[PDB]
Amino acid sequence: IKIADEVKKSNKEESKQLLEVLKTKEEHQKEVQYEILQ
């Protein structure tokens, strides 16, 4: 979270996996707050 711009516009694979792991954490942290409302 709040990752630098040199990583977001990157093209290596190891800097693409990091973005698609921090994205599925914020897509899971937003989902456990919805499960409480269930």
Added chain:
Amino acid sequence: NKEESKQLLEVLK
């Protein structure tokens, strides 16, 4: 006449 088809068939070929 049918001169157009031999020029149109080889368009697809």
Added chain:
Amino acid sequence: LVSTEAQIQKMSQDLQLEALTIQSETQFLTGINSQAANDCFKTLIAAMLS
């Protein structure tokens, strides 16, 4: 400086960040960039000289 693209890429393997698991290790990578490096080398020195 060590490149901030090639440092969080190296930091995220020593942490073993795991997707689908809310860890307290995903927050170690906040604010790591080359613009807050030259903003903390200066605040530590310019406050000392004044």
Added chain:
Amino acid sequence: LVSTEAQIQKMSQDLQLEALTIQSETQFLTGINSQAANDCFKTLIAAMLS
């Protein structure tokens, strides 16, 4: 009070919640909001006073 959007986000890291399973620690966060702490403070004081 402590902001309930940031109290869960700290409590959901000490617990280390994992997705795609059913753990007994996603139930530790239910019923935590500011409408309830402000209602359990009164049900303790006003039931002792009467």
Added chain:
Amino acid sequence: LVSTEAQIQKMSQDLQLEALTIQSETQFLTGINSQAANDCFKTLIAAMLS
């Protein structure tokens, strides 16, 4: 040579390569091919000979 498609598969089972995790074991497989096997056998013999 041992086939370079049949060796990275066996090298991905000796390690525990798993997705949804940033491992430092993903980089154990880069730069393995038969063009770089005939390049390191040559630049070791031909550097010692000259």
Added chain:
Amino acid sequence: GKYNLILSEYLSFIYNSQSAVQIPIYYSSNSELENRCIEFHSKCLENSKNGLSLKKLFVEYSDVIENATLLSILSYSYDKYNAVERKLVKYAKGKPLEADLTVNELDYENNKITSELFPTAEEYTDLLMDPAILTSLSSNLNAVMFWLEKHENDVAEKLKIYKRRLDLFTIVASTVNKYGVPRHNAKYRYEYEVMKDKPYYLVTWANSSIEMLMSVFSHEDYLIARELIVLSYSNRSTLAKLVSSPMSILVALVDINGTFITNEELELEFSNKYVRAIVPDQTFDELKQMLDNMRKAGLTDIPKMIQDWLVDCSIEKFPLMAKIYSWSFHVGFRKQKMLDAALDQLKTEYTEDVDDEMYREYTMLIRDEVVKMLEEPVKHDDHLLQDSELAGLLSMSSASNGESRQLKFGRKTIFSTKKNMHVMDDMANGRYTPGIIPPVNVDKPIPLGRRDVPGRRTRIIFILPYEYFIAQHAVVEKMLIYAKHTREYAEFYSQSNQLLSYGDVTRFLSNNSMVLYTDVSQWDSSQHNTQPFRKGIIMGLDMLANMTNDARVIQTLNLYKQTQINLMDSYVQIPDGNVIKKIQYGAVASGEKQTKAANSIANLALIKTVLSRISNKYSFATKIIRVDGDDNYAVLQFNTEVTKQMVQDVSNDVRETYARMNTKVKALVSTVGIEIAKRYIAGGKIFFRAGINLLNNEKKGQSTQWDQAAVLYSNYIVNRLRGFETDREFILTKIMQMTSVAITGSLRLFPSERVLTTNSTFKVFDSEDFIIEYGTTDDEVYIQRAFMSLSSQKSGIADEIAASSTFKNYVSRLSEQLLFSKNNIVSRGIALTEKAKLNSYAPISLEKRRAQISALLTMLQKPVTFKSSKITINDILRDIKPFFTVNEAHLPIQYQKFMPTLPDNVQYIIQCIGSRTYQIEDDGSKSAISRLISKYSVYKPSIEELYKVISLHENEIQLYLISLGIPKIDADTYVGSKIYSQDKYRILESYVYNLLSINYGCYQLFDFNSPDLEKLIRIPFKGKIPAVTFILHLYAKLEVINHAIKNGSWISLFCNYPKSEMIKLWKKMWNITSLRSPYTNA
């Protein structure tokens, strides 16, 4: 593409005028090439509007021809008169075939002139000769004449295929030209005013003849097609059964060298046993009388082929004998009158001198089988027998009822016959009794229907009322469950592959064993089926009325008894002329719900008795008795080796003992192979029937031309895999005429290869045969979304009926009977089932499909501009495809071929990776709600409704579960354990295993878990993202076979799929559906 090249030469053949022009239409995925496509299509419409050519324009716009792909070809044809007969006289060289008249035993089935066969105009029923396919004879003759000019100049081998398809065309063309080509109407129905002078059965003869001469490849095919085209003009009745007769006998002559086998839990092994074929001299005297009945019928080149094979009796030349049997069913259907088909079926001779000592054992064996099937779901009060009125009505077949009733649904009144529409009327007018079933006696008899078989005499069928379905649904759904857990009934051996299911025949075949396959001459209307079959079942429901204690399991078991009391005497209602003829028929009713679950009881319990009476002379030990309605076999294992006299004296003791129960039969025994279904085990190699009429349907359907062009191709790929090679250049010529659409007068629109062969609703034929190809290129996934956007159409008939006061009074009377609560997620979920159930009505589904195609014409006359970001199946495979690396690899031929009639490019896959060993079941997991709802209530909800339930509140899941009938402690153990939260990840994963098919027309034959396909597929393993792992090892296993069929060579993949692209694909696999998945990309 190859199909586009056949298109532009079909246009240059049928339109040989200087007024004719062809305008290609193009589209592309590029936004730049789309404006290249709009300007090109505009100029060919303005330049060809006023007499300007296109050779100066195709060079200027050659940036769009070689790069974009073809969408359609427009055709301008200012031709007033069809030029079929003008180019028919070029082939009309031979003498015309004169019909014969002494060859049939009837009058209408003879080949007479229609003026002499029907005296006036009003009594002209075309339903004896009607092909009922949506093509014509005038369009078939253009499909052969196109082929006979493309292959005129040929090389020295392909000329003899062309020459043999020409002398067989002069037989057809010189007969059609004598009377002239018949002119049809717009409904493809041949009227009387055109068939006044033509001979009857000229359309259905020349349609069945053109189907034959587009399959004549070798000289062994030409001698059959020469002696069937000439003869099928004369005798329409006897010809299909005289040629197809000795194949039931010829299957018993071939030896067994190495055969397949299936073990007890159904899985495939290979055996090597050598078993002789032992036939007595009364088989070669029954085969000579089957070869003299084929010589009196005129044909003489077929029994010379058989008698040149009888001196060999070898499996190497048996593909010739299976070819002769399969060409017999292509002569066309045997349609006859409704009166002569029933009155020759409902005539039977009963006899009071039958052995009554054998019936009281046959009645008891039906009694002890009905009790054996329902002793468990009646002693425990089952959830489906207690709701027999509802589970029979909520899942109600909507095919037809007996009569035509004037149904009134609000404003729009309709004349329908569908069965669930009769339930909606009678539940609205109050004339519907749940516990009273109507009596089928001399008052209110049974109506009739017919089903036509390509070689058999036209049979009748019974259409019982709808109240004989609600009485019989719940009990017989409990008898099909026991038929799937018993080794005798043939609902057990019913899988996708055919080697697994019909391969238990060759398990006990040895040299001390004798197999026994018998076919009763007619299973309906036998003496042993009128009284001793009903009273064996009524006795079985007396002992089952004592097993339980409820007032509701007895009451549904006193209705299934009442439908057998009422059918012990029955009457059929068949009209003729102006009188109605009521015929008494107390025998079994082919057409109930009961007609297959109680043809496996009544035939097993019969053959368990006739195998008991032949054990007074020969002492044996029977091994299996498999029974499938009438068609059954029963392996007998002896003490000594089986000789030529034990075969003869068992075939004389099963035929005679069946005659002691007044059941006329022929009883065949062998030691090598049987003919159980139409699938024939011969010499250890399964041989199939392979007869499907392409250009002749048995009845007109509820479908349009764009759907009947798909079943012309689907009847060809089954015909090719089974060993009947029809020419692909004729099938492709017949798709370019059926998918023709006339926009205006003198303007036809022809779709290209990319409209037909793509994977969408508008699919007709695959590009290369036997394989599905999901096109991952950007010009082909972009048009799939253009075809998946207009498949959702609404029909105005189904929405005028769904808002009526009758249909709402049926759902509210069905929702009140099911649930004792208030919730509307089922009333809105039942009403979506009967709106989907009303697609069986003909003008509803026709106005669905015509709104698919008339909205396609607006998409095909213009270049497509529809850009949408929908996730398709063809978008998943665009992200997998650049990460495959192919490498050529060699793989030997290990396994043996078991079906010799397969083509060469399919048989090479079987010889390398093996036939299928076991049926793979990888359907994930059913959700935990659907195991909780389907166990208490009989309401089966859709999986898009159970996801809607989970996303509700915690207190609204519990209200939904209690609504269906679940108790409180069971739902509160569900909801309280938070396993509704785990079922979000089992519904969303249930659409992944549904996606890609390991079964198809061709993919069922191969072994996908073979250790020779797993050697070529080299994919590294990642522990997480399980959904992606399945679709990688399935698409890799399909890509090697889709390459090894097209080119005959094997490739070995390597998919180092990175971790950053798996998690991008993991959310693409969970967002195919239209529901809220927690993980999306963007």
Added chain:
RNA sequence: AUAUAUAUAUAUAUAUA
């Protein structure tokens, strides 16, 4: 102005004011 039963596998398609 308009007739096509039942069961078993298999494939294609579909769900939304």
Added chain:
RNA sequence: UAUAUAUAUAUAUAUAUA
């Protein structure tokens, strides 16, 4: 020193079969 459990969604059309 520690890496969860569980086998028959529905409807219509189409072909093979009974």
